[PDB]
Amino acid sequence: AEQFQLRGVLWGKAYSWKITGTTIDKVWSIVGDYVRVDNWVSSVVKSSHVVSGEANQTGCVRRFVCYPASEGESETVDYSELIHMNAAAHQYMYMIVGGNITGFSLMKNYVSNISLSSLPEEDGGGVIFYWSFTAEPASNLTEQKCIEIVFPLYTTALKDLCTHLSIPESSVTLLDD
Amino acid sequence: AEQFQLRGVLWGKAYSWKITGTTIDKVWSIVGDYVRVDNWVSSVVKSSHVVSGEANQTGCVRRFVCYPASEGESETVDYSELIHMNAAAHQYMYMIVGGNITGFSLMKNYVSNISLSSLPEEDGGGVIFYWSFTAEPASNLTEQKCIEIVFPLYTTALKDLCTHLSIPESSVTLLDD
Numbered sequence A, B: 001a002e003q004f005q006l007r008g009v010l011w012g013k014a015y016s017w018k019i020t021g022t023t024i025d026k027v028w029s030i031v032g033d034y035v036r037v038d039n040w041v042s043s044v045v046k047s048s049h050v051v052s053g054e055a056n057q058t059g060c061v062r063r064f065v066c067y068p069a070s071e072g073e074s075e076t077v078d079y080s081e082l083i084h085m086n087a088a089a090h091q092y093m094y095m096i097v098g099g100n101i102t103g104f105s106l107m108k109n110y111v112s113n114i115s116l117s118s119l120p121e122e123d124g125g126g127v128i129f130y131w132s133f134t135a136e137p138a139s140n141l142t143e144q145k146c147i148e149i150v151f152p153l154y155t156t157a158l159k160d161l162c163t164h165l166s167i168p169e170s171s172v173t174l175l176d177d
């Protein structure tokens, strides 16, 4: 029992938002439909389908297609595997297992976590949206560059969430901003 | 760019608590002092110190010793590595890399995440304490057993945190997931 094995360290960051004027169920209807992320981050994602396993069950793989970055550029594609799903607890975990999404496909073993929590009713309710990622250090990136890839997308997704919820963007507050 | 590599799924769960009556900095002074977890979960941990790397810097390993879990039994020991740290953002990640801590040492690649967030000053303040874990599925365990091992420890740790902060136990509220 007096021995240990060193492991590599990770890059990453976790973010949390408070969302008012909605419920965990309404947010989850959009955010929790993992294989239909095209119905969530619709400003970036053109379409999305399950390509392995059963839709939204642990182990399944989604393939989604992103709109071109500019006129002459091609659409890009993501493959990501649901590696944990707990719908009852409004939380899941996924990782990129293929594709060529700009920035994201550069990272080594990008793994992301989403968790929704309800604030107590007597405090006016609202939802805490937790979203984190990690990636393994590799020579072609830095942690800072990973954060510069991830955080603007998370930000866009929170804005797209509001659009689908028909609530104002001001409904969302990034905690510790 | 149209193929993917399937991976195994994970076990785990994420929990969030609201903590009132304190500040994120006070909480962090206890929770974020990774190598002195004996100053936090004092009802379980007898002693703790860094045994590899620089204290509370990513890559470091702490060794801590726990009191006999029940009478008759012997002390147990944990070795865990800090695999991510962002002190200014009040979040870190660690994993067990050795030892024989009851329950926790049975899991394969136990990885845990702690993240503190401030609720808006505007809406009354308070701290959100996020704590999650994953483990790799293994034949000698079940995910249910993992949760039965982990959750009571997290719960005890939040109680001990209140003791050290000199705030009532009523300060902590587990959020509905």
Ligand SMILES: O=Cc1ccc(O)cc1
Residues within 6 Å of the ligand: A084, A085, A086, A091, A092, A093, A113, A114, A115, B011, B012, B013, B014, B113, B132, B133, B134
């Ligand atoms: O399935 C949700 C989940 C999220 C974060 C974790 O750390 C573990 C599980």
Ligand SMILES: O=Cc1ccc(O)cc1
Residues within 6 Å of the ligand: A037, A041, A044, A045, A101, A104, A112, A153
């Ligand atoms: O966090 C995963 C993710 C990455 C890129 C997207 O377009 C959508 C989700």
Ligand SMILES: O=Cc1ccc(O)cc1
Residues within 6 Å of the ligand: A121, A122, A123, A124, A125
């Ligand atoms: O807005 C405060 C509030 C108090 C008690 C409730 O049940 C709901 C809201």
Ligand SMILES: O=Cc1ccc(O)cc1
Residues within 6 Å of the ligand: B037, B041, B044, B045, B104, B112, B153
């Ligand atoms: O989350 C890991 C952990 C386990 C036992 C402890 O006593 C403290 C932390």
Ligand SMILES: O=Cc1ccc(O)cc1
Residues within 6 Å of the ligand: A002, B049, B050, B051, B063
């Ligand atoms: O008994 C083994 C041992 C190793 C490192 C320590 O810091 C303490 C004990």
Ligand SMILES: O=Cc1ccc(O)cc1
Residues within 6 Å of the ligand: A111, A134, B111, B112, B133, B134
């Ligand atoms: O628990 C989160 C986690 C992140 C990256 C991994 O490689 C494994 C687990």
